[PDB]
Amino acid sequence: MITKPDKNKTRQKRHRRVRNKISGTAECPRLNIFRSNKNIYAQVIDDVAGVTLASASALDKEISGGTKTETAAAVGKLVAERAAEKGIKKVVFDRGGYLYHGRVQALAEAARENGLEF
Amino acid sequence: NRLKEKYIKEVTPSLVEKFNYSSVMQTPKVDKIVINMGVGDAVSNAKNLDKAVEELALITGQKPLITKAKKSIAGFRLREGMPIGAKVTLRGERMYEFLDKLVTVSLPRVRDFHGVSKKAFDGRGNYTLGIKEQLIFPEVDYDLVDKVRGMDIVIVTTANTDEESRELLAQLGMPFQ
Amino acid sequence: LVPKRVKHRREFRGKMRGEAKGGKEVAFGEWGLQATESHWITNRQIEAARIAMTRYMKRGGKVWIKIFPHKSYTSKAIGVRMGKGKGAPEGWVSPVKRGKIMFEIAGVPEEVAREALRLASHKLPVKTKIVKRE
Amino acid sequence: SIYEGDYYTYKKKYSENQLLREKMIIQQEKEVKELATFVQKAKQASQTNHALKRMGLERAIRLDKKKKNLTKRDKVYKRVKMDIKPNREVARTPLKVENVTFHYPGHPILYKDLSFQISGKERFLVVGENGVGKSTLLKLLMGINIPDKGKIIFNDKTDVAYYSQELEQLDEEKTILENVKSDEYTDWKLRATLSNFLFYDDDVNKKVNVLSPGEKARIVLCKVLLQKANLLILDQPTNHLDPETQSIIGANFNLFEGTIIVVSHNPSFVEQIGINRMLILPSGNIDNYSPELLEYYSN
Amino acid sequence: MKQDIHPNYQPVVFMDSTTGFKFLSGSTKGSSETVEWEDGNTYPLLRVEVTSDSHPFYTGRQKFTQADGRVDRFNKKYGL
Amino acid sequence: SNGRDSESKRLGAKSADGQTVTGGSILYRQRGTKIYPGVNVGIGGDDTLFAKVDGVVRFERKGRDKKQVSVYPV
Amino acid sequence: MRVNITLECTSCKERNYLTNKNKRNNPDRLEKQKYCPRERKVTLHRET
RNA sequence: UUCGGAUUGCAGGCUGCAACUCGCCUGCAUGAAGCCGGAAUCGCUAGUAAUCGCGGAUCAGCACGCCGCGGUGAAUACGUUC
RNA sequence: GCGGGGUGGAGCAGUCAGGUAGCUCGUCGGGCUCAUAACCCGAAGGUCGUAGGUUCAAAUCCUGCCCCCGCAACCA
RNA sequence: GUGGUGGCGAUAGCGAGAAGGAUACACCUGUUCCCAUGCCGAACACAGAAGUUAAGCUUCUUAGCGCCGAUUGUAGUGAAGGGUUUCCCUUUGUGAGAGUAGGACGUCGCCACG
RNA sequence: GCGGUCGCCUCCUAAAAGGUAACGGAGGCGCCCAAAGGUUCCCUCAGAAUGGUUGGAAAUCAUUCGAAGAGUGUAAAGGCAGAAGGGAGCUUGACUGCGAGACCUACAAGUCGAGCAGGGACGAAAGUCGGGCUUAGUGAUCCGGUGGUUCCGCAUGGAAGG
RNA sequence: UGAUGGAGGUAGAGCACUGUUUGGACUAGGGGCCCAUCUCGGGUUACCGAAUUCAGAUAAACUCCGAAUGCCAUUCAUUUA
Ligand SMILES: Nc1ncnc2c1ncn2[C@@H]1O[C@H](COP(=O)(O)OP(=O)(O)OP(=O)(O)O)[C@@H](O)[C@H]1O
Ligand SMILES: [K+]
Ligand SMILES: [K+]
Ligand SMILES: [K+]
Ligand SMILES: [K+]
Ligand SMILES: [K+]
Ligand SMILES: [K+]
Ligand SMILES: [K+]
Ligand SMILES: [K+]
Ligand SMILES: [Mg+2]
Ligand SMILES: [Mg+2]
Ligand SMILES: [Mg+2]
Ligand SMILES: [Mg+2]
Ligand SMILES: [Mg+2]
Ligand SMILES: [Mg+2]
Ligand SMILES: [Mg+2]
Ligand SMILES: [Mg+2]
Ligand SMILES: [Mg+2]
Ligand SMILES: [Mg+2]
Ligand SMILES: [Mg+2]
Ligand SMILES: [Zn+2]
């Protein structure tokens, strides 16, 4: 008998504290990241309005796929260009309670390169 | 790999059949093994703790975590944070290897060995074996030990019931009384 | 009767206004002694009332003392001028407000109960009346 | 403080000054005690005795002014305390040296077929002059030097403690406490003994590199004491030690219940130890100790 | 697994000298004697005299005679 | 012996709800965070709530059992 | 034993900062990287 | 300790009606204190002290005791202050 | 309320200024003596009133508490 | 329908029980990789898709716990008065806590995949 | 008169803003930390039950229950489990020149402060940092010491002295 | 003065925390006491009884709650100055 904590629950416990000093505005939306064992998702959200201005993920059918790190980089590029189309340039990067090390870091760097200012 | 192979091959189907599990995921398994050596003599001489730590590391194959007294107790001449007692955690392949060696070699070498207890269950399917003395593990070398000492080996499994835990441990080989 | 401990050695005299907050009805016993006025009751008075009640009952039945002298009161010795801090603790009292059931009794015929409660009331400093369990 | 004269004159002048200072502090304490005793008497008198209560407060003011001008007696500097005891017992033949020859490669043989035998609980003095082989012989016994010829045998009952001449047993980089760290002694035991050697509190965390030669000598001696050996190979132990500590060292060794192989050019230290047999160098001569030591020195 | 802090750990084979029961498991101790093993591999061999198979308790049969009754001692003593 | 006490610290609210206040005005003095700082409201080194901007003060409830102060410019 | 100390810029020898330290816990002279207003840049300040 | 031979377990030999209280002895096993003994104190002047055995009376059985026998075999005595 | 003290059986050090528990008498045992005393030789006897802090370490420093001793507890 | 992400006082919860993984989320397979354990690839990080709804997870049932909670009455009390005035009473306004009827196993949004 | 007290912090008195006295009821302060500060990241307690060598009520170990019953250097109150509690890495913002505007207030003082500039610490970034969970840990002027100073320098240059 | 919005923990009330506290149920444990001791293995007082639970109280320095008033403020409304 031993219980293995829900990793998503632990993520969200950290993510609340992260969000306490990160919020999305119309002129500086929140770039939230969510990570799955299979996929990864990015959302540009306006917390004031509570609406996802733009979205990208490993299910867009525009990302051919590959290694999960490479999929994250492709998703980062895709969200950056979609956000640019909607005129969104500056963003505040919400790492969603993860560690800014691997897949999330690759996604963030892809977004930075493709034009999101942060 | 012997004990892991034994488990996955023989034990898993046997437990599945015995306990009528809908899905294989329900099969109890040894999650981890935590071996704790409580050294109160550290207060008198830290070298006692150092020798105990060296013995435990040799026995286990991993550097132990040197636990510290969470509270200061005058009864034992103990101040909070004093490095009294050590432990090691073993999972996966190292866990299986150490458990197999304990079953085969170390247990027979125990003085006047008549088996292991059959009641040291927490009530949730986790067992603990209280070793009275070292020198039963072949790695000890029976000579380096200036002072003989014991330990407590806690086997933590996913078994929900003491019954399932007992079956798994027996199948893995446990000389219950 | 004295508390084993007190958080504060000295305490305000206080004010007794209105009915008792609780314990106005007989809980355990068959009969009870209800105070019709508000007044301090010393541990000495409680003990005197208890002795009277029990002795008349012949130590039979059961007796409950609902009140307890939680509060402490101090005093100043004769020949001491006003000031120089509060006086040293002297005695213990229970502030009893009208409607409180100070004593309860059971296990005895009604005449014995009424007579025992009458003796206890005469020992106490408050006007009282007899009440039956509902 | 600078005096005119010699060492004795300084001691005479100093001893008198501390005596005259001590008497001053005594009399200042008596007057304070006198006032204190009266202040208390007034304090406990009846509140109705107005005059006594008044006088008590007046003397309380004088008592306060006294206690604020009362010279503190300087704490007398504490002397070293040594209690060297052997764990085990000496044998009748602690050390056997037989036909031992040794030469430093490229230099004349210091001694040829040197053979001596110590008896146990014996004060053995290795006499000689500078550059004659005294320290070489002691290094030979410990094992620092391997004998060119012969054998050196220690009885299994013999534990040996070595005090090197040049203080080569201390780590300058480490602290005092780190140097004395041993598997057989706990922390407070180390601190207690270091306090007996005048290393108090955070004085044990000082690096050995900043200590004076004399303070380092105490650490080496402390290491020797903590061994609790029954054979003491000491090479000029009193070197670097202040005259007071030398007498303490000699007196305690005299009472040591074990064998002592000592080298010392200090005439006072050898007298206190009470040497039994002296070994002269370079002319090997195992001899009974006596004022004939002077005869060898003359010759 | 951290590097350079764990005691040297190596695979090793154990054989029960009495019965010859074999098993491969890791250990801190190393054996100069080495043996072959299935899969075409060799490992250091740490021979052991007492193992589960050899030890009486695992077998379930006891080597000891369990001593004698005192009257039986007396029976053999006086031929009775 | 009793008879000691410290000067009162004049804690409490210093601006009413619905009042207009200039930037930097102290809204609330407190020990600890009895009331939390909301929008455009900062909390000082000693838990004093002040307005970061000019606006009207509003005391709201932060959830079930916590209060909060916000300053809304017009 | 805790005592107030002055930190002086090692470059311009300007007594710039005032602080305090426990001698027992920090026997050696304290050193910090602090802004030197005279030189208007961060420099090594050592206790005197 | 290959000194020591207590204590203890086992297994036995005898005598006796009988060996637990409570005999002696034997074999195996175990292997205690003890490293030459504080204040003080004892015997002995030659075949003596020391030391080595042997026999005996008592006695079914049972002595490190007692009586007796021989083997080997010393040191010291200046002197009578105490 | 003001002081003084709690260490071996008794009396006292040691406390200030942290390292290691002592002196005297007394007690127990053995000697000497015809016997007792004196004398001689051994041994025991306290975790320092107590509970917590400070320290690496407390008989020792800090705090409280409990005991015992002396004084005071009201003045024209 | 599922998965992200929010707003609103738990009427959003807790407990118990039931169903599902098509997708998705998960467990799950390993440590070669960046990275990591004051020891452990348990965690964190990485690579992958053998099996499972077992667990989490989502949906559903349930008022057992927690939560919300009307009306009436009462205590208290502002104002105006009275009395035998430590206290008590009267007129007028306000009006709890407690106790209860009852509510409630959430609702209001955005996005991606269906 | 004797005893007690004199300044600062916390609570109750204090009558639900603030303030409010008594020789009223209770406690603390005259410091501490070179990390017990800043930042980034990460973590969640106390006790209980059960099982387990020394080990005993109670040392360390494991599962479960457990919303705070812990901890927060230090009194109490307030606050804190989105941590202010705890661990680790790097660091010195425990910065310099200030400071709109407030609180408090007889004065002298005391308290808070966004924000600007300079030059930095941490972080990928957002951003945080002008000491510490908050509130005690302090003393006017005169006089003197030490350092800096493009200030003055009794005819002028220095000096002395400011 | 009315309307509106606020901050606060008093009266009252309450036991959700902290003290104080009554009775009932049960009992760890403690006290006696016997047998049997290896204090040890038990059987007992309706002996004292922790903790839990049921019922019932209590508080200036207790609060899950919580007024009436008073207080702060409104480019508000009426009157007034
Ligand atoms: N490591 C060495 N290498 C070469 N020669 C040496 C060495 N050590 C000593 N010698 C020589 O040995 C000779 C004597 O040796 P040793 O060190 O014993 O002198 P000593 O007896 O200790 O004299 P002292 O202590 O009074 O100075 C010296 O002349 C010296 O030069
Ligand atoms: K009456
Ligand atoms: K017999
Ligand atoms: K015979
Ligand atoms: K894994
Ligand atoms: K499931
Ligand atoms: K519900
Ligand atoms: K840090
Ligand atoms: K109250
Ligand atoms: Mg030399
Ligand atoms: Mg105050
Ligand atoms: Mg601050
Ligand atoms: Mg011998
Ligand atoms: Mg004769
Ligand atoms: Mg209500
Ligand atoms: Mg008021
Ligand atoms: Mg107020
Ligand atoms: Mg802190
Ligand atoms: Mg001039
Ligand atoms: Mg009230
Ligand atoms: Zn500079």
Side-chain angles (χ1 to χ4, degrees):
Chain A
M1 170 53 65
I2 183 177
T3 49
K4 54 209 177 180
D6 182 317
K7 290 192 177 185
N8 191 21
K9 288 187 182 66
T10 315
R11 176 199 75 87
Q12 290 175 336
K13 290 172 64 173
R14 288 187 303 267
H15 182 210
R16 291 197 324 161
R17 304 187 173 185
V18 168
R19 289 272 283 99
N20 271 125
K21 58 174 62 175
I22 291 171
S23 189
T25 58
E27 75 292 350
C28 188
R30 203 225 313 173
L31 168 52
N32 159 275
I33 304 308
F34 170 58
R35 188 188 66 194
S36 164
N37 303 129
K38 278 185 167 187
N39 306 332
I40 191 171
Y41 317 73
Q43 299 197 16
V44 187
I45 313 178
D46 193 3
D47 299 325
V48 181
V51 301
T52 75
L53 296 182
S55 174
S57 53
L59 320 185
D60 283 5
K61 312 265 283 182
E62 301 186 8
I63 292 173
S64 186
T67 272
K68 282 187 293 197
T69 296
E70 293 177 350
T71 60
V75 172
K77 161 160 187 60
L78 180 47
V79 64
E81 58 186 41
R82 292 172 170 178
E85 291 169 357
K86 271 189 169 52
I88 308 311
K89 183 176 180 57
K90 282 170 64 178
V91 303
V92 63
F93 183 82
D94 170 10
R95 57 186 178 86
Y98 305 111
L99 183 66
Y100 178 77
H101 163 90
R103 284 194 283 169
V104 301
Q105 174 165 353
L107 196 169
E109 290 190 336
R112 283 194 175 90
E113 296 163 2
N114 289 270
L116 286 181
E117 204 289 339
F118 75 91
Chain B
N1 182 86
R2 167 176 293 274
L3 193 55
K4 183 182 66 172
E5 174 179 355
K6 187 207 298 183
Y7 168 85
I8 179 53
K9 306 277 77 158
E10 296 81 353
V11 182
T12 287
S14 60
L15 292 172
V16 169
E17 300 156 14
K18 294 160 183 175
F19 299 90
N20 180 11
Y21 294 149
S22 180
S23 62
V24 183
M25 298 300 304
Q26 307 170 22
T27 301
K29 69 189 182 183
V30 189
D31 177 301
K32 63 177 181 179
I33 297 172
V34 183
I35 175 166
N36 173 91
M37 195 176 186
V39 176
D41 198 356
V43 182
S44 175
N45 185 351
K47 259 56 59 157
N48 319 138
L49 180 280
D50 187 4
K51 265 176 298 312
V53 160
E54 178 54 292
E55 297 161 350
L56 180 59
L58 296 170
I59 298 154
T60 60
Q62 301 183 29
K63 186 181 75 181
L65 179 63
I66 303 171
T67 72
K68 304 174 186 174
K70 64 177 186 175
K71 183 185 296 183
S72 305
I73 301 175
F76 315 142
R77 304 148 67 260
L78 181 60
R79 308 247 69 169
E80 172 171 347
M82 280 179 162
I84 67 98
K87 82 184 186 183
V88 174
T89 299
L90 303 85
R91 284 187 175 87
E93 320 303 2
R94 303 288 286 266
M95 183 198 67
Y96 279 114
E97 293 180 19
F98 185 92
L99 182 58
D100 197 326
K101 291 196 289 178
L102 181 74
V103 167
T104 61
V105 180
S106 301
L107 285 173
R109 303 196 74 261
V110 177
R111 287 184 186 267
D112 52 72
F113 188 77
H114 301 61
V116 288
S117 170
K118 50 200 295 182
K119 301 158 286 181
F121 287 73
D122 70 338
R124 304 297 203 290
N126 296 322
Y127 183 82
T128 176
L129 162 58
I131 304 304
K132 299 179 60 52
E133 192 200 327
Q134 62 250 3
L135 315 188
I136 60 184
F137 313 92
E139 287 72 345
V140 182
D141 203 352
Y142 71 77
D143 53 358
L144 310 176
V145 170
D146 73 330
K147 176 185 174 180
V148 301
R149 299 186 142 280
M151 54 182 58
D152 306 325
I153 303 177
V154 179
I155 295 76
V156 175
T157 77
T158 56
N160 298 314
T161 67
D162 295 5
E163 326 304 0
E164 295 149 317
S165 176
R166 191 194 335 272
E167 289 297 345
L168 167 56
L169 298 168
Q171 290 193 242
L172 296 173
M174 268 298 174
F176 298 96
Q177 296 161 22
Chain C
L1 285 182
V2 181
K4 293 179 179 179
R5 290 167 40 189
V6 292
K7 189 190 290 169
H8 309 277
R9 274 237 298 168
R10 298 171 177 83
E11 187 170 351
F12 287 164
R13 290 134 170 104
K15 291 284 184 288
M16 290 176 296
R17 279 182 292 260
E19 307 298 325
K21 289 180 65 260
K24 290 177 286 188
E25 297 72 359
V26 183
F28 314 91
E30 300 170 0
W31 298 92
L33 188 57
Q34 188 182 48
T36 57
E37 301 175 341
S38 304
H39 202 286
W40 280 7
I41 305 196
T42 70
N43 57 6
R44 293 174 173 273
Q45 297 162 2
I46 292 173
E47 198 63 12
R50 197 273 301 172
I51 293 170
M53 232 158 46
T54 60
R55 98 201 316 166
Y56 179 83
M57 297 168 74
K58 293 179 179 179
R59 309 174 67 186
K62 193 117 176 297
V63 177
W64 297 262
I65 306 174
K66 306 291 289 301
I67 60 177
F68 185 90
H70 299 299
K71 184 174 288 185
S72 78
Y73 71 87
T74 75
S75 62
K76 286 187 171 297
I78 283 69
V80 177
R81 310 227 188 100
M82 297 291 91
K84 293 184 66 173
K86 196 166 169 66
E90 189 193 5
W92 301 90
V93 299
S94 177
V96 179
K97 298 195 290 187
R98 58 175 187 276
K100 189 78 175 185
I101 303 299
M102 295 169 293
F103 296 87
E104 298 178 4
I105 58 183
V108 296
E110 168 165 1
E111 287 195 3
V112 173
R114 292 182 178 276
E115 178 57 14
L117 297 179
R118 190 188 65 82
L119 300 170
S121 66
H122 277 101
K123 295 292 173 185
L124 289 175
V126 178
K127 304 178 80 77
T128 69
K129 62 181 290 179
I130 314 307
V131 183
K132 183 178 179 180
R133 180 85 165 284
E134 310 81 16
Chain D
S1 59
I2 174 54
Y3 315 74
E4 283 227 301
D6 47 322
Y7 190 94
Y8 300 145
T9 305
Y10 136 71
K11 285 294 187 175
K12 197 185 65 53
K13 299 288 187 66
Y14 176 83
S15 307
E16 295 170 14
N17 290 345
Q18 310 300 300
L19 185 76
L20 263 55
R21 185 166 200 272
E22 168 63 9
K23 286 172 180 166
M24 285 296 287
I25 297 169
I26 290 167
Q27 301 298 344
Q28 287 174 357
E29 273 179 340
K30 292 186 177 171
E31 294 140 343
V32 168
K33 186 184 177 156
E34 185 188 10
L35 277 169
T37 297
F38 181 81
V39 172
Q40 178 51 29
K41 161 153 144 282
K43 277 189 177 183
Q44 68 182 50
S46 156
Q47 297 83 328
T48 71
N49 197 344
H50 294 294
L52 178 49
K53 290 289 181 204
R54 162 83 259 109
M55 290 200 173
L57 301 167
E58 188 188 7
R59 268 69 160 167
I61 291 285
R62 303 185 204 179
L63 175 60
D64 157 54
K65 279 165 193 293
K66 294 259 186 188
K67 291 173 143 292
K68 205 192 177 166
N69 291 332
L70 155 58
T71 51
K72 294 190 174 187
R73 55 171 57 91
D74 287 317
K75 299 172 183 171
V76 188
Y77 193 59
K78 186 165 180 175
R79 296 199 174 192
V80 184
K81 289 191 184 183
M82 304 171 56
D83 197 355
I84 307 187
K85 297 172 170 175
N87 258 328
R88 296 194 295 176
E89 70 291 333
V90 300
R92 291 192 179 276
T93 57
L95 174 54
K96 302 181 185 181
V97 168
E98 57 195 34
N99 289 337
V100 164
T101 295
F102 185 85
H103 72 291
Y104 284 109
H107 302 262
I109 301 181
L110 293 161
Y111 8 84
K112 309 151 286 171
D113 292 20
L114 179 90
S115 73
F116 61 82
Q117 204 177 23
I118 318 304
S119 59
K121 194 176 177 186
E122 172 187 353
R123 306 300 180 269
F124 192 82
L125 182 65
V126 185
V127 193
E129 303 76 32
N130 295 131
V132 77
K134 295 178 286 88
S135 300
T136 306
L137 176 55
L138 307 186
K139 294 167 185 171
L140 207 58
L141 304 175
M142 287 301 304
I144 304 172
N145 297 344
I146 303 178
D148 190 77
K149 188 181 297 305
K151 296 182 178 180
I152 304 170
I153 311 93
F154 285 94
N155 189 291
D156 299 78
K157 295 290 192 59
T158 301
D159 297 328
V160 189
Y162 183 53
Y163 176 98
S164 56
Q165 181 174 353
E166 294 179 354
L167 310 178
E168 306 176 13
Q169 310 177 232
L170 299 176
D171 316 336
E172 300 295 348
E173 302 172 348
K174 292 183 180 180
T175 55
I176 300 177
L177 190 63
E178 292 170 352
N179 274 214
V180 190
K181 272 180 176 179
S182 187
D183 301 1
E184 310 174 24
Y185 285 95
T186 185
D187 293 2
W188 66 270
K189 283 187 162 195
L190 298 171
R191 306 290 294 266
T193 55
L194 288 168
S195 190
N196 291 316
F197 279 93
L198 312 180
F199 296 113
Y200 301 112
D201 300 358
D202 297 79
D203 287 326
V204 304
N205 295 320
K206 295 201 297 182
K207 302 293 183 179
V208 178
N209 64 34
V210 316
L211 300 171
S212 59
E215 297 177 352
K216 284 185 291 189
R218 297 209 234 96
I219 300 174
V220 183
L221 292 162
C222 187
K223 285 174 159 291
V224 172
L225 185 158
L226 290 193
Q227 290 183 18
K228 299 194 73 174
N230 54 33
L231 174 59
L232 298 182
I233 305 177
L234 318 175
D235 200 347
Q236 293 177 335
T238 56
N239 186 71
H240 287 342
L241 296 185
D242 52 59
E244 295 184 341
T245 308
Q246 298 173 5
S247 63
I248 298 170
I249 295 263
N252 301 134
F253 280 147
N254 174 26
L255 312 179
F256 180 60
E257 189 188 26
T259 317
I260 302 182
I261 301 172
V262 63
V263 180
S264 182
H265 286 108
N266 175 16
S268 300
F269 176 66
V270 298
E271 298 159 5
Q272 296 172 350
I273 278 192
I275 301 298
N276 301 128
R277 292 200 300 167
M278 49 180 168
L279 172 61
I280 312 300
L281 295 173
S283 176
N285 291 320
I286 306 163
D287 178 18
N288 293 331
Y289 181 78
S290 34
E292 296 184 21
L293 178 79
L294 312 185
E295 301 174 8
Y296 287 113
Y297 276 134
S298 60
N299 303 343
Chain E
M1 216 200 181
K2 285 201 178 67
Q3 306 302 338
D4 312 330
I5 64 132
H6 295 305
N8 177 261
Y9 198 78
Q10 38 168 107
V12 62
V13 175
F14 299 92
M15 64 172 295
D16 184 65
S17 190
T18 301
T19 67
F21 163 61
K22 265 287 210 306
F23 61 91
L24 168 56
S25 178
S27 172
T28 306
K29 183 178 179 180
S31 65
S32 61
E33 162 51 24
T34 173
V35 300
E36 282 62 359
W37 191 258
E38 50 271 26
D39 306 357
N41 190 335
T42 177
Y43 311 82
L45 176 279
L46 237 175
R47 172 187 164 284
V48 196
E49 237 301 335
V50 53
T51 61
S52 64
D53 306 58
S54 54
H55 184 261
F57 188 82
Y58 298 80
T59 67
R61 293 182 183 174
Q62 289 61 61
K63 57 139 288 182
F64 298 97
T65 69
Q66 306 300 345
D68 181 26
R70 307 211 78 260
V71 170
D72 289 345
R73 164 194 85 105
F74 167 94
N75 302 342
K76 303 155 185 55
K77 233 204 295 180
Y78 299 76
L80 310 175
Chain F
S1 176
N2 304 316
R4 300 167 304 286
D5 196 353
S6 63
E7 299 296 349
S8 315
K9 299 296 183 181
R10 280 76 168 179
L11 306 184
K14 306 302 183 187
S15 305
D17 183 302
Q19 176 184 19
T20 297
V21 299
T22 57
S25 295
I26 294 171
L27 309 180
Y28 202 82
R29 298 277 208 175
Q30 54 179 342
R31 299 276 76 87
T33 174
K34 181 167 285 181
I35 302 181
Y36 286 80
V39 191
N40 315 323
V41 176
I43 183 169
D46 65 338
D47 314 273
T48 68
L49 316 183
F50 62 93
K52 286 183 174 174
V53 310
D54 308 2
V56 306
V57 176
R58 294 296 179 188
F59 289 87
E60 304 106 337
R61 27 167 293 273
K62 194 179 67 164
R64 165 184 293 270
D65 59 335
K66 296 183 175 180
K67 282 165 182 291
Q68 177 194 45
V69 192
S70 301
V71 177
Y72 298 112
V74 183
Chain G
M1 176 50 53
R2 179 164 292 277
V3 187
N4 308 325
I5 58 163
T6 301
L7 296 178
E8 156 177 335
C9 181
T10 57
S11 301
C12 59
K13 307 299 181 298
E14 197 73 6
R15 303 248 179 86
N16 278 336
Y17 286 86
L18 175 73
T19 176
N20 58 109
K21 54 114 75 166
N22 184 287
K23 290 186 75 202
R24 176 178 293 98
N25 312 333
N26 310 282
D28 52 331
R29 308 208 298 177
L30 186 63
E31 295 187 353
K32 299 296 183 181
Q33 296 298 127
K34 306 291 287 183
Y35 183 83
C36 173
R38 181 177 181 170
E39 295 154 338
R40 300 170 58 201
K41 75 186 190 301
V42 171
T43 66
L44 179 71
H45 292 71
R46 181 178 298 100
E47 167 187 349
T48 39

